[PDB]
């Protein structure tokens, strides 16, 4: 098992 | 100099297309299949041209949420820079149009999937395997910095793998033409530069910082600065202390120390020789830089393909309805698009 959580981009 | 005539000839082709300016085609000519990725302002799906039969990667952006978050400047820069640049490691653009509710972009489909999904499964890449991918980012950043362009978003979630194991750079939402400095807060928390957090007016040196974080994550299997809350990650970035694993080679450790230098005075990529310091390093010793640009070096890993239109190398998502209203949503804003 592996929870591949993708990283999002931060703005503002 | 050989590359000097290359970057001088490339700066002539880019500026010619930069002032060439819209609505190439329309949504009625595409067959939506499966969603490849999602974001805060839209999703990216796999579409097939009903007439030509070619498969493409359509990027949808909601025109209402972009205006609601003041992202019009970043939206126009993503389209204006994509169709102008030309590089084998950069993703290609085909059609760009818009309707009443959403902005649309049609890119070259890269069925090999993200580097994130491939790196998370293996665990970590070997140093020759990591040097192969790290060498393509050097030639790409060298080409983009010569055009006074910054990426400001280097992460495995924005790096694709083609049919020959090479990199296809996408997600140009934070690209911007900057000669001097800029003061916009953007990027990925695990990849932000220290001066970006300090609001210090950064230049093209932030792309070299993200290069060091990228190589560290590929060779180890995790970024050097990461935790639960983003405030904890910022305490590690501005600190300047890095903890390296034991399996790293000392030549890789020394190159990361010069790239992850929070001091702009001693950071690689922003010195006298600039990019020449990264090519002649002890790590990139046997690297054939010309054959990498010519795509002649054999690929250590090539993803599995079932032909064009195979979404096997992409994670599954929940499908929804493409909402297109009857009223024009912020039409006066998106005119140069
Ligand atoms: N040309 C392409 N071929 C295949 N997959 C693609 C392509 N372009 C985008 N994708 C996928 O779509 C996902 C989202 O695209 P992206 O351009 O990052 O939108 P985004 O909202 O800007 N993501 P982010 O800015 O990091 O929050 C990517 O992570 C890829 O998996
Ligand atoms: Mg992304
Ligand atoms: Mg983006």
Residue numbers in the entry:
A (entry chain B): 8 to 19
B (entry chain A): 13 to 33, 35 to 350
Question: What did the paper state?
Answer:
Our structural models for the three complexes all show a monomeric form of PKAc that forms a 1:1 complex with PLN, which is consistent with the solution behavior of PKAc.
Here we present the crystal structures of PKAc in complex with a peptide corresponding to residues 8–22 of WT PLN, at 2.1 Å resolution, and the R9C variant of this PLN peptide, at 3.4 Å resolution. In the structure of the PKAc complex with PLN R9C, the NTR diverges from the structure of WT PLN bound to the enzyme. The mutation to Cys abolishes the interaction between the positively charged side chain of Arg9 and the negatively charged helix dipole at the C-terminal end of helix 4 from PKAc and a hydrogen-bond between PLN Arg9 and the main chain of PKAc Arg134, which releases the NTR of PLN from binding to the large lobe. R9C turns the NTR counter-clockwise by 26° around the hinge formed by Ala11 and shifts the Cβ of residue Thr8 by 5.2 Å. The structural change in the NTR allosterically affects the conformation of the catalytic center. The Cα of Ser16 is shifted by 0.7 Å, which results in a conformational change of the side chain of Ser16, a displacement of AMP-PNP, and a subsequent ~0.4 Å increase in the distance between the γ-phosphate of AMP-PNP and the hydroxyl group of Ser16. The KD value of PLN R9C is about fourfold higher than that of WT PLN. This difference confirms that the loss of interactions between the NTR of the peptide and the large lobe of PKAc is linked to a decrease in affinity for PLN R9C. The kcat values for both PLN variants remain relatively unchanged, suggesting that the increased distance and altered orientation between the hydroxyl group of Ser16 in PLN R9C and the gamma-phosphate of AMP-PNP do not significantly impact transition state stabilization during catalysis of phosphate group transfer.
